[model samples]
Target: HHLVSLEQEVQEKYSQIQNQLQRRADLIPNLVETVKGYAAHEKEILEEIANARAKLIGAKTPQESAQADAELSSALSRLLAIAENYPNLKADANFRQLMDELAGTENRIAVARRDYNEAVKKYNTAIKKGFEEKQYFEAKP
Candidate 1:
């Protein structure tokens, strides 16, 4: 029962992280469109951002999420860099609000992913120790 509880807790944490990542992914299309409207000339960067967002959406596991996270971060960094070049985009209230939301969501995703990774590591460690000590029997409630 204790083992089942522990596994359930781990799964819950992972699910929370996954949901956060999905939220971040949901923000990307609108963000990309906003930036694209202001920087249509930046077709290459826009395409890259779109591709990264797609990869993020498709990631199904923590390790895959980590990879997609890196790519998305890079693409967003590039987009922000392009934003720096556009005085009008910088002054647009909608763009500013979107950027702020994206920033907050990104931070939330980062923290959630970190927490999930730590939980996974702890769970794996506990399982390893239990097996190594021949204590593989399920724990009673």
Candidate 2:
């Protein structure tokens, strides 16, 4: 039962981490808008966002969120590189404001991801500490 509960907590933490990824995914719109505003020309970047979010619910830790985060950064970097081609989007005050909000949103996701990793770590260490296994076996035989 002890190990079982620990495993459940591990899965719980998994959900939390995915929740963080979900919130982070919510910010992709800002990047997409900026890109499209510039010229609706970046088709592949949007496709990548779709692909990354597919693995999002499967993400299990801050480490896993890190993968999605890296993908976001890469997309944003590509956006930035392309934004250089458009003076209008770069100069738009709305775009600047959106960028600020996106950064704050990113921070919230990152903070939650950290907590998620800590929770999972606690469950993992407790499960492998030999105590939980013993409790389960003891309760069994």
Candidate 3:
């Protein structure tokens, strides 16, 4: 009974990570469009973000999801870096709104990831030799 409960908790926690990742993915189209208006010439990073977003959406396992998430995060940081070069894009009202939303979603993802890892730790500890140990969803470096 205890093991089952803990297992379910871990699954639930993982879904929260998925939820936030989906939320992040949903925000990207608008983000890409807004960036395009100002930085139309910057195609490579934008394409990278799109590809990363698709990978995240298509991910089936926790391992794949983590990898895709890392890719997307890296791509997004690069986009923001280049945004610094465009003063107009930096000052755009729509861009600011999207950035704020993205920031909030990132915080939520962090919280969800930590919670999932904690649940996995508990679940794995509860399992002895009968079941396979639950893998922790680690953030990529």
Of the candidates shown, which would achieve the greatest TM-score relative to the real structure? 3
Tens digit of lDDT per residue, candidate 1, span 15-91?
A: 77677667778887887778777888998888887887787788755566767777777887887788889989878
Pairs clashing within candidate 3: none
Best prediction by lDDT: 3
Instruction: Give each model's whole-structure lDDT.
Output: 0.71, 0.61, 0.87
The digit string of per-residue lDDT tens for model 3 on 1-141 reads 988899889989998988888998999999999999999999999999999999989987777888898888889888889999999999999999988888887788889888998988888887864556876776455
Off by over 4 Å in 3: 129-132, 139-141
lDDT of 2 by residue, 1-141 (tens): 766776676567556645555666776666666667667766886677666665454655445556656666566667667667888988888777766775676676656555655665666677664433211100111
Q: What's the residue-level lDDT of 68 in candidate 2?
A: 59
Q: Which regions of candidate 2 fall more than 4 Å away from where they truly are?
A: 1-16, 29-31, 54-65, 129-141
How many angstroms is residue 78 displaced in model 3 relative to the true structure, after the best TM-score fit?
A: 0.9
lDDT of 2 at 48: 75
Model 3 TM-score? 0.92
True-structure RMSD, every candidate: 7.5, 8.2, 1.7
Better of 2 and 3 by TM-score: 3
